[PDB]
Write a protein that binds this ligand. Structure first.
Ligand SMILES: [Mg+2]
Length: 212
């Protein structure tokens, strides 16, 4: 078994022993064997990774996360499952994907997604543009009615910058937009434009707030 991790502000790309390509986003850990010797190709992951799985009908590939197993024969898909986040999501780019959870099994096709809420156990299957979901691969951000708390975790991880919400302010906002390789400052300005949320820098801390 080997394990790789990705620091905040970084990515990694790895090719697995079966030829599967995995792109790992900031803050992610993945554990995999140097050889797939069993009847399944199993990896364990916490964080976010995009898998382009080499087709082997004879040997399913399983991405095992705390919340779910994602099982394919040959497919490309994103798994966003940061242990610190309120949401986990699996989004299919190509092929067919099975998501196995304790009390739910669902099959997904391209541009379908499952969102699991880690805090209240809700499970939502819906449509979503997987090309936008996976914009992170090219340094993009994509928000589609994304809760501000989740946005902030994405920003912290992307930019390697601590960002906290003013505890005396209500942050009930949902964020929309696509940002292509923007500065943190620019992304925060765009949020300000959309929500009124302001930001100020402190000793190694950005604090978000509101006024009026
Ligand atoms: Mg992490």
């Amino acid at each position: 078994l080997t394990e790789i991790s990705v620091n905040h502000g970084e990515h990694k790309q790895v090719t697995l022993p079966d030829g599967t390509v995995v792109h790992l986003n900031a803050g992610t850990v993945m554990r995999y064997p140097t050889e797939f010797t069993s009847d399944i190709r199993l990896v364990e992951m916490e964080g976010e990774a995009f898998f382009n799985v080499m087709r082997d009908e004879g040997k399913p590939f399983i991405v095992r996360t705390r919340q779910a197993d994602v099982k394919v024969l040959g497919a490309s898909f994103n798994v966003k499952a940061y242990q610190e986040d309120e949401l986990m999501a699996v989004s299919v780019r190509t092929g067919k994907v099975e998501v196995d959870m304790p009390e739910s099994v669902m099959r997904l096709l391209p541009n379908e997604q499952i969102i699991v809420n880690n805090t209240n156990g809700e499970i939502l299957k819906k449509n979503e543009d997987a090309q936008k979901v996976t914009a992170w691969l090219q340094g993009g951000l994509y928000f589609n009615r994304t809760p501000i708390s989740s946005v902030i975790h994405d920003l912290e991880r992307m930019y390697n910058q601590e960002i906290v919400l003013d505890p005396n302010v209500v942050f009930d906002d949902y964020i929309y937009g696509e940002h292509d390789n923007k500065s943190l400052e620019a992304v925060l300005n765009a949020i300000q434009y959309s929500t009124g949320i302001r930001y100020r820098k402190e000793e190694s801390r950005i604090v978000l707030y509101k006024t009026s």
